[PDB]
Amino acid sequence: GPLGSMNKFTDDEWNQLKQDFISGILENEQKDLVAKLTNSDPIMNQLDLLHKWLDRHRDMCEKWKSKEDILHKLNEQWNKD
C-alpha cells in the first residue's frame, strides 16, 4: 500500500554510517575510552560490540537524521556506557 514512514537505512548505508561513527570515535580524544573498553586494544573501535550496540539503537538515528549531532549523543552515552 502507501509508502510507510519507515525509510530505514540499508546495510550498505548503515555500514557507511558505521565508519563515520568509528571515525568520530578515533577523531575525538574519546577514542581513549574505546581503547580501555577493550582492556587494551588500538582503534578496534569495538566493531563487534559497536556494531551490535549501534544496531540496537539504530532507531536513534531517526531522532535527528543528522550526523555530528548524533555523534554528540553517542559520546555522552559512550561515557556512561
Side-chain angles (χ1 to χ4, degrees), residues 1 3 9 12-13 20-21 26 29-30 33 37 41 43 45 47 53 57 61 67-69 73 76:
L3 298 81
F9 287 92
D12 288 342
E13 292 301 338
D20 291 338
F21 279 32
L26 94 73
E29 190 186 11
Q30 301 176 341
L33 309 179
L37 189 145
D41 315 21
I43 310 180
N45 76 51
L47 296 168
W53 191 89
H57 303 297
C61 74
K67 180 180 182 183
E68 293 186 301
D69 286 3
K73 284 40 172 154
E76 189 182 3

Side-chain angles (χ1 to χ4, degrees), residues 4-49:
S5 114
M6 288 190 294
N7 303 167
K8 70 184 290 193
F9 287 92
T10 63
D11 288 348
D12 288 342
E13 292 301 338
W14 206 233
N15 296 339
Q16 295 167 69
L17 181 74
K18 300 190 192 201
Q19 298 303 305
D20 291 338
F21 279 32
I22 296 162
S23 182
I25 298 289
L26 94 73
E27 183 267 301
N28 295 323
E29 190 186 11
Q30 301 176 341
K31 81 186 81 178
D32 288 352
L33 309 179
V34 67
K36 303 192 195 347
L37 189 145
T38 72
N39 319 140
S40 161
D41 315 21
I43 310 180
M44 180 62 215
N45 76 51
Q46 298 165 207
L47 296 168
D48 179 358
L49 309 186

